Design a protein around this ligand. Structure first.
Ligand SMILES: CCCC[C@H](C)/C=C(C)/C=C/C(=O)O
Ligand SMILES: [Zn+2]
Ligand SMILES: [Zn+2]
Lengths: 154, 154
């Protein structure tokens, strides 16, 4: 019944932010928006990972949320992880003003992302086009800069 | 659905801990265990609040999770909030070795607490027996010392 969710991103370094999720219809897309600061200018992978487990920091969130056991892709690919939201772009001040609409993640059902972990990564997601085994798993997006558990919101 | 959940508790002060949840059968009880350190010796209210919203620290989690619109009570009362897990006891070293079993919360379905916020409070929960308005809402457990969003665990 959740139509709204929210996530506070934190990590070891300066990266932090707040990301909102809104889904007016359970059969409709999820709007994803907010601000992340402290990033290097440019593209950063932006993924929902499987577990809402931050006991060992972002490492314990596990791999990309992939209940259909597909290969990694970009959000517009048919072959993609449910958690594959592509990249977000930080401006010259280090601020990513996130604005994504996605119809594969959901706030309910099998693809529900509530209770899982949103992660913003060190470098660009290659969207599965990197030609190596890592590309088909993580997009070569590198280390986890900040994360948080996605929670139900008012 | 989920059989395991986990929660990392943090706050403005020194209180921190890790709480695990286990529900081997979807229609059976939830086991809740772990360790919270940095507490004053004695009883501390221990509740699931409605929203997994940490944007204002523990404040934005809202009231106790109460989908059945009941009055506050202790875990063994029939008249209780779903989020009413009672008290946890911190020893002389400031450590609460939590061990709770509850049949009202769940890790799936309508009483699902995944994506909501676990909070440990400053004072004892009076279990609804304090004789004022506050008693039947929060148990007079006082301020929110630490909290975290409850996430799906491996
Ligand atoms: C190992 C460094 C590769 C970085 C390359 C110059 C750009 C990439 C991968 C971005 C791709 C994209 O736009 O998705
Ligand atoms: Zn992926
Ligand atoms: Zn209550």
């Amino acid at each position: 019944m959740a139509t709204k969710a929210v996530c506070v991103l934190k990590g070891d370094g300066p990266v932090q932010g707040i990301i909102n999720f809104e889904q007016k219809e359970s059969n409709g897309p999820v709007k994803v928006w907010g601000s992340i600061k402290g990033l290097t200018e440019g593209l950063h992978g932006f993924h929902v990972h499987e577990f809402g487990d931050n006991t060992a920091g972002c490492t314990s969130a596990g791999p990309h949320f992939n209940p259909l056991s597909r290969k990694h892709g970009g959000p517009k690919d048919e072959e993609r992880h449910v958690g594959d939201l592509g990249n977000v772009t930080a401006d010259k001040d280090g601020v990513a003003d996130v604005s994504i609409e996605d119809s594969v993640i959901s706030l309910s059902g099998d693809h529900c992302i509530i209770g899982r972990t949103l992660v913003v990564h060190e470098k660009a997601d290659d969207l599965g086009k990197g030609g190596n085994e890592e590309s088909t798993k993580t997009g070569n997006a590198g280390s986890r800069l900040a994360c948080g558990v996605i929670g139900i919101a008012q």
